[PDB]
């Protein structure tokens, strides 16, 4: 198997505009949304067909109840942060927890929090400690680290539970998550050479330009990997042509264990 990951996000907003939910939580497997919940619907719902297909209503009922409680806890934590920051107005609180199962079978796990979109607290599951970015985070770190059982609960969830869930969802979504659609790649010129790839899945891809067999990363403009809307992705990379000297340029594309070279004549 390629590398895969499972992660859950939470977003809390302290003084939301009339439309906006004060709390949202979304799960992902790789780039695929799998679950959603917010404080307007107050229901946890699947965001992928193969999640709804394989988890019975009892599962969504139970997790809906869990998310209603996590929502209240999240509000209580944000209220505390903003009071301690002595901040007025609307501020955001975010959480991300998850794990990766790597190609070699090794695993990673992570848990971290943000305030106003900036790192706030970062869990280290190997030293069982919280990294604090400022002295408001530092107060929380001290309270959280005084509850040693909860740190241990988090380490076990990251290292064992999360990986078991990920393997279960990977099987549920096998036909989507474990497929390969190779890139279609072409070179055009707009004077720069553009190497353009589209139609590919998974989104991980590496494109670069070589100039007479050497790679000059400083000379290359790298486009983002973008969703095309049909479940595949597109990407591009460009280099500028030397108008005084010709050179042998070649686009190089690596995708899902296949390498491709487009020599520009």
């Amino acid at each position, epitope marked *: 198997m390629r590398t895969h990951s499972l992660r859950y996000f939470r977003l809390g907003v302290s003084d939301p505009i009339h439309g906006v939910p004060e709390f949202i939580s979304v799960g992902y497997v790789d780039s695929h949304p799998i679950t959603t919940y917010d404080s307007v619907t107050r229901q946890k719902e699947p965001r992928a067909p193969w999640m709804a297909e394989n988890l019975a209503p009892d599962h969504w009922e*139970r997790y809906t109840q869990l998310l*209603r*409680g996590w929502q209240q806890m999240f509000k209580v934590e944000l209220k505390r942060l903003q009071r301690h920051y002595n901040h007025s107005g609307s501020h955001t609180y975010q959480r991300m927890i998850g794990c990766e199962l790597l190609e070699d079978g090794s695993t990673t796990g992570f848990l971290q929090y943000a305030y106003d979109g900036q790192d706030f607290l970062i869990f280290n599951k190997d030293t069982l400690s919280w990294l604090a970015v400022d002295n408001v985070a530092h107060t929380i770190k001290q309270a959280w680290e005084a509850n040693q*059982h909860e740190l*241990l609960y988090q380490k*076990n969830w990251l290292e064992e539970e999360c990986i078991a869930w990920l393997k279960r969802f990977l099987e549920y979504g096998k036909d989507t998550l474990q497929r390969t659609e190779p890139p279609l790649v072409r070179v055009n010129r707009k004077t720069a050479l553009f190497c353009k790839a589209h139609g590919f899945y998974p989104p991980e891809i590496y494109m670069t330009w070589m100039k007479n067999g050497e790679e000059i990363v400083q000379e290359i403009d790298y486009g983002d990997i973008l969703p095309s809307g049909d479940g595949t992705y597109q990407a591009w990379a460009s280099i500028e042509l030397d108008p005084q000297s010709s050179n042998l340029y070649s686009c190089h594309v690596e995708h899902s264990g296949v390498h491709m070279v487009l020599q520009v004549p």
Partner: antibody, heavy 108, light 114 residues
């Protein structure tokens, strides 16, 4: 899902007893021991979720996740240790699954 | 801690009864269990927060109401012999804390008779 512990155990004052709890659950978010004197509220004793032994006075609690079992170890038994001991496991849905309890009888 | 009442109650089949439970620990979550010989505690209903309830493993024959943050009552609308049991109220800081332990009341012994 199933939690198993012996119905009853009898040991002598001043000795040591090990109360076993095995579990087969769908996922694992930790194992709890509670003590419950006859006629009284259960009270929390211990929580284990990573492997190994944790001590708390005369009581130790051990966990092995790969074997799916825990024990509560009581050293230097006193008559006041007479009580039932309840094991409980939180599963993948954060549901507490309770064992039927082990009644510990102490011979003076 | 957790205070529940009554300590004992005899009831006739078909009678209605309300068990009371309060906690003064500023906990959010409260629970009602029954304890029966030869089996583990079974959850009847709980209340993750002030102003919400939810079913447990054996809710048939029972109802609950979370009156304020402190109080969480269990009612038997139509008492049945099978409801002869010892009922325990419990609370915890948050239902959704992984490692969070329960704090139990003293228990309410109900005997339902024909």
């Amino acid at each position: 899902q199933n939690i198993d512990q012996p119905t009853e155990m009898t040991a002598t004052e001043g000795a040591i007893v090990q109360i076993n709890c095995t579990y087969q659950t769908s996922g694992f978010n930790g194992l709890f021991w509670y003590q419950q004197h006859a006629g009284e509220a259960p009270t929390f004793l211990s929580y284990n979720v990573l492997d190994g032994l944790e001590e708390k006075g005369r009581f130790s609690s051990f966990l092995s996740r790969s074997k799916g079992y825990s024990y509560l170890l009581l050293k230097e038994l006193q008559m006041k240790d007479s009580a039932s001991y309840l094991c409980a496991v939180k599963d993948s849905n954060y549901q507490l699954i309770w064992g039927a309890g082990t009644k510990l009888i102490i011979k003076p | 801690g957790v205070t529940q009442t009554p300590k004992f109650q005899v009831l006739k089949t078909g009678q209605s009864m309300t068990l009371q439970c309060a906690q003064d620990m500023n906990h959010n979550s409260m629970y009602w269990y029954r304890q029966d010989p030869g089996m583990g505690l079974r959850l009847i209903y709980y209340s993750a927060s002030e102003g919400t309830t939810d079913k447990g493993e054996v809710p048939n024959g029972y109802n609950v109401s979370r009156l304020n943050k402190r109080e969480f009552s269990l009612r038997l609308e139509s008492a049945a012999p099978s409801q002869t049991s010892v009922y325990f109220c419990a609370s915890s800081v948050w239902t959704g804390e992984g490692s969070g332990e329960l704090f139990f009341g003293e228990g309410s012994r109900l005997t339902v008779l024909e």
